[PDB]
Design a protein around this ligand. Structure first.
Ligand SMILES: CC1(C)CCC(C)(C)c2cc(NC(=O)c3ccc(C(=O)O)cc3)ccc21
Length: 136
């Protein structure tokens, strides 16, 4: 499956509840939720090699990884973590995160390519956030 290209968000669900579950300050969530509404996503892929740039006005993250090989990135709430990308299935990547410093909610994300739509999922313990993207 090809995740490469530029994507824009079609819908988000529970992004605020996610930030709640991760203990983010109501005023920060206000800013985050706002910025997260109009995110721009760039994905360059080469087999298991992935480049994903996510941009908003107040924060842009650039992650690079090889499915099957751990890498370092940040959690949704900015905490630096250790990540473990894996092919859950042919078109879905599952990624487990373990915080480098401190302790917190068990988090992970999963990116799935389904019907030319990119389904992004953020988990913070029991809370699940679903963000659907379409090819811009
Ligand atoms: C105000 C500030 C600095 C506070 C710290 C946290 C709470 C860490 C934070 C998080 C975001 N996150 C996003 O903007 C975002 C956009 C798109 C996606 C996605 O769909 O991939 C995910 C997250 C934006 C701003 C901030």
């Amino acid at each position: 499956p090809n995740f490469a290209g530029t994507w824009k968000m079609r819908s988000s669900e529970n992004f605020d509840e996610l930030l709640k579950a991760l203990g983010v300050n109501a005023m920060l969530r206000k800013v985050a939720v706002a910025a997260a509404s109009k995110p721009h996503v760039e994905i360059r892929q080469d087999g298991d090699q992935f480049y994903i740039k996510t941009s908003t006005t107040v924060r842009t993250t650039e992650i690079n990884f090889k499915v099957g090989e751990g890498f370092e990135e940040e959690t949704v709430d900015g905490r630096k973590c250790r990540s473990l990308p894996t092919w859950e299935n042919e078109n879905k990547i599952h990624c487990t995160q373990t915080l480098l410093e401190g302790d917190g909610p068990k988090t992970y994300w999963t990116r799935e390519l389904a019907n030319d739509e990119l389904i992004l999922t953020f988990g913070a313990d029991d809370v699940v956030c679903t963000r659907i993207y379409v090819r811009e």
